[PDB]
Amino acid sequence: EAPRSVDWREKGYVTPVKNQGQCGSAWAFSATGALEGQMFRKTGRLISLSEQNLVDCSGPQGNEGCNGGLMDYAFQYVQDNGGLDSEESYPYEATEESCKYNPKYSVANDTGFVDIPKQEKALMKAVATVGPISVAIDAGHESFLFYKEGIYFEPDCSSEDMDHGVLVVGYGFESTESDNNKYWLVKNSWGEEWGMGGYVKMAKDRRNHCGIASAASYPTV
């Protein structure tokens, strides 16, 4: 059913690569990325959203700022809060601070969130049909820190124990490789200087490599 390749960057759904810095807030970048994409589908306007707003304000929903969080908790916060400020109005500080949410500058909302079944087939259909998808992966390996190009495959990766929130913006296959040559196109939040301009081609259809299909979701708008 779904296409052989998808890349939502080419459709206008994806803001440039951001940088979480020395702060365990990738969950917030994964959440704003997914929300950026769904707001763009709804309105035709791509507007960068505030990770700091999530970091400072979503404690009641279960998040712990620079000590970690979950995309689903971020999506519930946006719903409970009745809005989310723009990046411009509430810039990123890479530290946990007091909540400064101002409804005057809200540019996004959500009505809930949908969790994808824990299968790469289901993740492929969601990516194809919905837009960019929030996912959790096992990023806790030196090979990931040193990633530069090509399809990332780490033999020691877990499908069950994930620690890092990122964003799947598409999938595809390498012309050059030829056996296990498919990948997920993943936007990270470590700046443009990491990986392929900030992106990693994560191995796809290699038994849910790094747990990419194990905790995937998106906000409903």
């Binding site: 020395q22 365990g24 969950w27 620079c66 000590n67 970690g68 979950l70 806790g140 030196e142 620690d163």
Partner: protein, 109 residues
């Protein structure tokens, strides 16, 4: 028999040749950072002087991006005053003057 944490930055431990020293430091690879010897390696500068093993321990957490811990197991192989010098950095960016550093000296007679 010898454990060391951040609390012991700059200390000297006297050890026997062949004795293991465990270094434990906060580390969060989900932020892109980890601890390294100069040049962005986990290996000893001089294997004949001391050996190093390194392992990351993820936190027990329902959340994504909680900090964990790196352990460095250092074994001294000869008499000397062995400097173990680590820097916390993103390896593709490298260090700066501001980077967090950890040093311990392992002294064997």
């Amino acid at each position: 028999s010898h454990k060391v944490t951040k609390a012991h930055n700059g200390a000297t431990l006297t050890v026997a040749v062949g004795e293991l020293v465990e270094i434990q430091l906060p580390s969060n690879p989900t932020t892109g950072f980890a601890w390294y010897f100069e040049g962005g390696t986990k290996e000893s500068p001089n294997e004949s002087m001391f050996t190093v093993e390194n392992k990351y321990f993820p936190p027990d957490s329902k959340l994504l991006g909680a900090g964990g811990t790196e352990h460095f197991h250092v074994t001294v192989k000869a008499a000397g005053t062995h400097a173990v010098n680590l820097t916390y950095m993103r390896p593709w960016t490298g260090p700066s003057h501001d980077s967090e550093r950890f040093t311990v000296y392992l002294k064997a007679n």
